[PDB]
Design a protein around this nucleic acid. Structure first.
Lengths: 77, 228, 186
RNA sequence: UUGAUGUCACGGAACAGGAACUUGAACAACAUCGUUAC
């Protein structure tokens, strides 16, 4: 809301010491132009499988009882 | 040593509040039993039952109030023949309130006082002319104050409040809180400590809901609810 | 009503016997299971009374369990849940409780740390759900057949380590004797 | 990687149920900084 480069999500990892510490904006900024992710088809799968890996890592960060989505009705006749 | 949350009685702290004790709650973060260490062991106060909270929807809805007459500004604008824009007025410094003047000491004797209600007076006749309220000197255009456009006294707005599943005494107290007595007045807006902002609210018709068909204007039950 | 019980169990928790720890885990599981679906006991918006003592006890319970995740908590709770499910009235509530058990404990049986009680009660839930399938096509529905097959698969998961069990072997034979009369092969 | 005298698989809708909702006046007055002297 101030206009500076301090977001609460896209700027995690920025400290006062060793100001070369990378943030998520810099990582996504240097990966959007790597001469192999320059066409449309190669960027789509990159974002898809990166999001899939982050979801798989976020899933098992709970402690309560976890319900499954849909496990019943596999009728194969 | 203690935070400001432990400087008042434990019954006046907000229910569904925060963690002020010494241990860190972030350890019980991935478990559902964490939320029970942040609520009061008795329930919800009378104001977190009409107005909502987190994990409970409130049952009173306000609305946008609209003007009905012509504006009638405070300072006439620079473009004549245009009765839809006012003139500017420069305010004073208006900076942050210190809470180390109501709690002066540091040990245990100094608790937290009440709720800081501003008083009604007439000190805008000195701002409108360009002077300071304390000293009589002029106001400079420093890069720390504001230049606003303000309405004058004598306007009339109109709004509407919807409510559901209220008791009788809750409606009586809400009407007592909307319309005050004959000599009193509310306060809203900016720069409340300089006289600016003094409204008075009157209550027009009240319509109830009997069934899904009829609605039964209930104006004849107000002197009951109030007393109740 | 489900929040006063947590505190009643937290008052006299001795952190040494395997009965009060089990009762505390049962109360926590029942409160969470009450929250997952939206019952009428969701309007209770109170909390726990003695904050620092209760925080110490709950952190010590969630900390002095991670070295003893032997499956002694959830297995016994779902065992008693199924045991209460068996002796019910009309089939509607039995069907709903069976599908809720199946949905809740299907995840915790896919690892190496798989208890024998957990797999045993999951196979019994599949077998008992396989009997309550109302036909509608002048023929047997395929979901009954695959419930029987899943029960066989889990009882084979248990009996792969041991040889005789006298409890899982009977479930295996019940599933086979049920597959025989549904027009299938042994 | 088929076997012959006999293939309706173009013989079969991945279909069916779930309010991104709840809570929040764009508001404001008392200082800041540490040492000097016997």
């Amino acid at each position: 809301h101030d206009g500076k480069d301090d977001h609460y999500l896209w700027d995690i990892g920025k400290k006062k010491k060793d100001e070369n510490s990378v943030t998520i904006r810099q990582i996504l900024t240097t990966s959007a132009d790597t001469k192999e992710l320059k066409n449309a088809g190669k960027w789509r799968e990159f974002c898809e499988k990166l999001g899939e890996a982050l979801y798989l890592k976020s899933k098992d960060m709970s402690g309560g009882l976890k319900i499954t989505r849909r496990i019943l009705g596999d009728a194969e006749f | 040593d203690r935070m400001i949350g432990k400087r008042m009685s434990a019954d006046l702290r907000p229910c569904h509040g925060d963690w002020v004790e010494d241990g860190d709650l972030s350890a019980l973060n991935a478990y559902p039993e964490k939320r029970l260490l942040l609520r009061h062991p008795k329930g919800l106060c009378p104001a977190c039952r009409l107005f909502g909270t987190g994990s409970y929807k409130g049952r009173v809805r306000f609305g946008f109030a609209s003007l009905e007459n012509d504006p009638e500004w405070l300072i006439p604008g620079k473009n004549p023949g245009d009765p839809f824009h006012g003139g500017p007025v420069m305010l004073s410094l208006l900076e942050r309130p210190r809470p180390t003047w109501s709690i002066p000491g540091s040990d245990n004797k100094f608790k937290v006082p009440g709720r800081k209600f501003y008083v009604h007076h007439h000190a805008w006749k000195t701002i409108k002319d360009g002077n300071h309220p304390t000293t009589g000197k002029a106001i400079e255009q420093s890069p720390n104050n504001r230049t606003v456009e303000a309405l004058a006294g004598g306007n009339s707005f109109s709004f509407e409040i919807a409510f559901e599943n209220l008791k009788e005494w809750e409606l009586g107290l809400l009407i007592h809180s909307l319309q005050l007595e004959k000599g009193l007045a509310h306060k809203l807006g900016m720069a409340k400590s300089m006289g600016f902002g003094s409204v008075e609210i009157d209550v027009e018709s009240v319509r109830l809901r009997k069934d899904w068909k009829q609605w039964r204007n209930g104006n004849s039950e107000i002197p009951n609810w109030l007393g109740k | 009503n489900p929040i006063r019980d947590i505190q009643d169990r937290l008052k006299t928790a001795k952190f040494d016997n395997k009965d009060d720890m089990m009762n505390l885990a049962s109360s926590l599981y029942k409160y969470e299971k009450q929250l997952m679906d939206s019952s009428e006991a969701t309007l209770c918006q109170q909390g726990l009374s003695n904050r620092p003592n209760s925080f110490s006890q709950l952190s010590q319970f969630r900390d002095s369990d991670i070295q003893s995740k032997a499956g002694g908590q959830t297995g016994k709770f779902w065992q008693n849940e199924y045991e209460a499910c068996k002796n019910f009235q009309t089939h509607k509530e039995r069907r709903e409780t069976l599908e809720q058990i199946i949905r809740f404990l299907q995840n915790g049986a896919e690892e190496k740390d798989a208890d024998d009680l957990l797999l045993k009660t999951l196979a019994r839930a599949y077998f008992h759900r396989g009997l309550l399938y109302r036909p509608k096509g002048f023929s047997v529905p395929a979901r009954k057949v695959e419930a029987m097959k899943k029960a066989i698969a889990y009882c084979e998961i248990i009996l792969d380590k041991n040889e005789e069990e006298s409890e899982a072997l009977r479930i295996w034979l019940y599933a086979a004797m049920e597959l025989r009369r549904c027009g299938e092969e042994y």
